């Protein structure tokens, strides 16, 4: 029933339209859904625009008229120039007239603002097509009609606002360079007359709605107009006084003044300097007298959220920070401007206490700008000493969690806070110390005691490490620890005492300079952490381990030497008691502990001592390992015991942890387990395969098989970790690689897809990266074993096997970088698959595939080029040059791969430059299809013209020919090349694009 408006043979029943619309906007459920589909089918009819004039005249539903204008919008922006000139004039005339008649009806003007705004925007779309060349009188007539009616004057401000937006703010993407410049020059040419109207309205106007609309248009003008209109007209006085008093105009006026504070101004002129001072003075005066005084509690105001207060305080912060970052020097020398300078900053102090994460970051960015300048610029810091003292307290009290006590927004904010507070500490070390000690006293006396509050203060204290002198630091750290220790005693209950203990260990972890110089204390700290590794309260064990490795990273040298009153380097002592120390830790925490020990051991540069420590550290995992190898070998059924599987995995993970911190020095331990480890890899592989055969693919989901595959993945990770850090590559090649490839490649190739580990590809990528140049036969074998079978997993859609997808192209990329010869050995059918696979990568939206796909294509072209004039390169260009050109063009133009535009452009420019540098020795055409002697340049130009004609049949031959002439002429200038491609992407979205647009660079 509702689907009757979709029959265009019959007249359009406006009444039936208004019901479909009403059911969509005000209906619900199935009716609304069905109407929605009908309205979309209606709007998308290429003839729906013809019935727009009917709807606009004879409909009583504003939503229906809105949809009529949307239909007109599509037609104007895409097919305007295709129309008979009759319809262009007709459409223009009944959009103009519709706007006039809505403005003349005070009832419509008041109640249909959405429809008028839509109509104004539609008018603007016509102006972008027709003005000024076919409408030179638009602006003079706009100004004339403004004086004959207030409603028309107000609406003209909306039209001028939208026009300025479309020409200056949103043109870069949506029109060609030539067309954008044409419209910018046209607006610039007639702006004198526009400004005169706008200023007259502002000086005389009564209607606040007209004033607000005029100022909203001024905001857009300020993005581009020359400074003279702002500084030579007294408009700053109006903005900074008159319009700051009425709340109706205050928001927009403040946004205008923020933009003014970014105007391109000469910095020689003393009078412009005084005008910049003056409007800031007026604005701050109006705020103090009309909104709130400097003493006002803006935290409370913002939290109450009355009216528009929150938006206003946000805008005030933006105004003050913007202006002061640019011009505060104007206020710093004249004693008569000192009060203004400090009041502006006192407002910022008050704004900085608001509880609003994003606003705090805006003010914090400014504070960073300030304290950095006070830190370097002579004679400035004394001016702001009282401001800075208040800021110290604000930042200490709003310190957020550092990542050492998962949230990347909090982490970034902590680092910004730390940076400002460090500057503030250098600026006055004494004041900072006093605030922090004082804050701590009120933690002890209970007046500000709180879990959040003690954490906050400890983070703040930890953040200024490295800014005090060593003596002051020492006295400071001691006082803090003492006060914290007494604070921990002072409490009872687990939770309370736990918070204070964490904060203690956090503070000490932040002061390694102190720890390094006080061995007895450092040792006491570590041994207290070890005590905490037996505490079972939730989170204590994690804290102790994180602190341990954190301290070790910074103080490792003091664990590896023999200290004055010690019989052995302390690392020896840690290792002796390691089983006891870690008995109560979860596996993850045991591995962190072993990794920490690995960091220390790597500091020992005597090889024989380093290796002795290594084998001592690994004694427990090595004995558990030896036991299991002797068993697993004598009874392969044990590996079905999920307890042995878990034990094996944790042994390997312990080796990964230690290898992570020791790198090249891990080799002796790797040699202890290597051969049996790869035998274990094979046996586990057999069991996974046997389980999938007996139970089906669902076996891969079971805990047993997931446990078995964990073993394989940790083994691969261990080898990957070592090889990526090895310094003796002869040993890598001659000892490690060949057993590895025999253990993993055939197992991968001959497993079913759902059983192949993507980690194998990742491991092979590291092998090729580090020693690929030395194992050309090994690389060939990798390709033979993973290339075709992995490609067949991922070439049916862009969905399945996402990890194999990413690792697959990382492997092809490194092989193509380091061992291109391996692709030369491929049989031609497999090399054809290689090209297909690259192009397949182009068409991924997935960034982790698209980027490598484009880089392989680029690197491949360079590899082929380097071969010179030989048969393989000549056959390559004959077989694949135009495949790469056309595949690159497809993703450049299909609108679904815009994330890769830059690299698509680079690849295309490289391909075109090959021909126009005659770096391709043979003809790219058949002996048949072109006269003998035709240059590849002439043929390329013809091939591309024909390709684009059939792919984009609505382009004229002239467009295509001019686009290609520009493109080839610009193939040595990437920025211009890209501009020409962007111009082409605009023109293919419409009919009738100007071919001369492609001469813009010329």
């Amino acid at each position: 029933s509702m689907e009757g408006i979709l029959d265009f043979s019959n007249d359009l029943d406006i009444a039936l339209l208004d019901q479909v619309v009403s059911t969509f906007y005000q209906g619900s459920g199935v009716q609304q859904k069905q109407a929605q589909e009908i309205l979309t089918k209606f709007q998308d009819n290429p003839d729906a625009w013809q019935k727009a004039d009917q709807i606009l005249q004879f409909s009583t539903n504003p939503q229906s008229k809105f949809i009529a204008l949307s239909i007109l919008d599509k037609l104007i922006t895409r097919k305007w120039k295709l129309l008979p000139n009759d319809h262009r004039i007709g459409i223009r005339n009944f959009v103009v007239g519709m706007i006039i008649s809505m403005c003349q009806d005070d009832e419509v003007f008041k109640t249909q603002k959405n429809l008028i705004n839509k109509s104004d925007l539609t008018l603007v779309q016509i102006l972008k097509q027709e003005w000024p060349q076919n409408w030179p009188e638009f602006i003079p007539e706009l100004i004339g009609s403004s004086s004959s009616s207030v409603n028309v004057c107000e609406n003209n401000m909306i039209v001028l606002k939208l026009l300025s937006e479309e020409v200056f703010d949103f043109s870069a993407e949506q029109m060609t360079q030539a067309k954008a410049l044409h419209l910018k020059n046209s607006m610039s040419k007639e702006f004198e007359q526009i400004f005169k109207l706008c200023f007259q309205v502002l000086e005389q106007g009564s209607s606040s709605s007209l004033i607000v609309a005029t100022l909203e248009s001024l905001l857009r003008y300020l993005h581009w107009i020359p400074y003279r209109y702002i500084y030579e007209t007294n408009i700053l006085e109006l903005l900074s006084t008159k319009f700051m008093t009425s709340p109706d105009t205050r928001a927009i006026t403040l946004k205008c003044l923020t933009e003014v504070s970014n105007l391109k101004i000469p910095q020689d002129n003393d009078l412009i300097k005084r005008q910049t001072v003056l409007f800031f003075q007026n604005t701050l005066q109006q705020i103090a007298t009309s909104v709130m005084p400097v003493t006002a509690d803006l935290k409370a105001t913002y939290a109450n959220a009355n009216g528009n207060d929150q938006s206003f305080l946000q805008d005030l912060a933006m105004f003050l920070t913007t202006y002061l970052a640019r011009n505060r020097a104007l206020l710093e020398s004249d004693e008569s401007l000192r009060e203004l300078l400090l009041n502006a900053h006192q407002y910022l102090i008050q704004l900085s206490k608001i509880e609003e994460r994003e606003l705090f970051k805006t003010t914090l960015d400014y504070w960073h700008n300030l304290v950095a300048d006070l830190f370097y610029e002579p004679l400035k810091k004394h001016i702001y000493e009282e401001i800075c003292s208040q800021l110290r307290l604000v930042i200490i009290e709003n310190m957020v969690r550092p990542e050492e006590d998962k949230e990347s927004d909090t982490i970034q904010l902590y680092k910004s806070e730390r940076e400002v507070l460090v500057y503030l500490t250098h600026l006055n070390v004494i004041d900072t110390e006093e605030i922090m000690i004082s804050k701590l006293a009120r933690q002890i006396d209970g007046s500000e005691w709180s879990w959040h509050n003690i954490n906050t203060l400890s983070w703040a204290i930890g953040s200024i490490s490295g800014t005090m002198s060593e003596d002051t630091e020492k006295r400071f750290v001691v006082t803090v620890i003492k006060d914290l220790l007494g604070l921990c005693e002072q409490k009872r209950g687990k939770d309370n005492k736990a918070v204070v203990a964490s904060d203690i260990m956090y503070v000490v972890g932040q002061y390694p300079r102190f720890l390094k110089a006080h061995w007895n204390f450092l040792r006491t700290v570590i041994l207290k952490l070890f005590e905490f590794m037996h505490e079972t309260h939730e989170g204590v064990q994690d804290m102790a381990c994180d602190t341990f490795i954190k301290i070790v990273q910074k103080c490792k040298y003091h664990f590896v030497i023999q200290q004055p009153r010690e019989s052995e380097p302390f690392i020896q002592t840690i290792i002796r008691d390691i089983q006891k120390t870690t008995a109560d830790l979860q596996p993850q925490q045991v591995h962190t502990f072993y990794k920490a020990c690995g960091i220390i051991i790597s500091e020992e540069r005597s090889v024989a001592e380093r290796n002795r420590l290594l084998s001592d550290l690994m004694q427990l995992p090595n004995m558990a390992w030896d036991t299991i190898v002797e068993q697993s070998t004598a009874n392969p059924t044990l590996l079905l015991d999920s307890e042995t599987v878990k034990i094996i995995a944790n042994i390997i993970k312990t080796n990964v942890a230690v290898c992570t911190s020791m790198g090249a020095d891990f080799y002796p331990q790797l040699g202890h387990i290597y051969y049996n480890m790869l035998q274990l890899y094979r046996a586990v592989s057999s069991m996974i395969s046997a389980q999938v055969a007996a139970e089906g693919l669902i076996a891969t989901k079971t805990p047993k098989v997931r446990g078995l595959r964990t073993i394989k993945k940790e083994i691969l990770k261990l080898v990957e970790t070592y090889i990526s850090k090895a310094r003796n590559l002869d040993d890598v090649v001659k000892v490690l690689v060949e057993p590895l490839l025999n253990a993993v490649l055939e197992d991968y190739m001959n497993n079913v897809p759902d059983a192949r580990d993507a980690e194998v590809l990742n491991c092979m990528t590291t092998v090729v990266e580090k020693v690929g140049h030395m194992i050309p036969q090994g690389v060939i074998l990798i390709l033979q074993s993973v290339f075709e079978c992995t490609l067949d997993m991922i070439n049916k859609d862009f969905t399945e096997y996402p990890e194999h997808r990413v690792e697959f192209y990382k492997l092809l990329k490194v092989i193509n970088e380091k061992s291109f010869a391996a692709f030369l050995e491929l049989p031609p059918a497999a090399f054809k698959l290689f090209v297909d696979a690259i192009c397949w990568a182009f068409k991924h939206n997935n960034r982790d595939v698209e980027v490598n796909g484009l880089q392989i294509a680029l690197d491949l072209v360079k590899n082929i080029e380097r071969m010179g004039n030989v048969p393989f390169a000549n056959e390559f260009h004959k077989n694949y040059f135009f495949i790469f050109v056309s595949e690159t063009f497809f993703v450049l133009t299909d609108s679904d791969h815009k994330s890769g535009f830059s690299k698509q452009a680079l690849l295309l420019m490289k391909l075109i430059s090959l021909v126009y540098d005659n770096k391709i020795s043979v003809p790219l055409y058949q002996e048949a299809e072109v006269p003998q002697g035709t240059s590849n340049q002439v043929y390329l130009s013809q091939y591309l013209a024909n390709m684009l004609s059939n792919a984009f049949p609505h382009l004229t031959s002239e467009q295509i020919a001019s686009f290609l002439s520009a493109l080839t002429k610009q193939c040595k200038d990437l920025v211009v090349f890209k501009g020409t491609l962007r111009d082409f992407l605009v023109q293919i979205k419409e009919v009738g694009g100007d071919p001369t647009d492609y001469l813009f660079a010329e």
Binding site: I481, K482, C488, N520, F521
Partner: peptide, 13 residues
């Protein structure tokens, strides 16, 4: 040397 603090820290818990 900081004997008092080491002992004071040693007794925490």
């Amino acid at each position: 040397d900081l004997r008092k603090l080491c002992e004071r820290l040693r007794g925490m818990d």
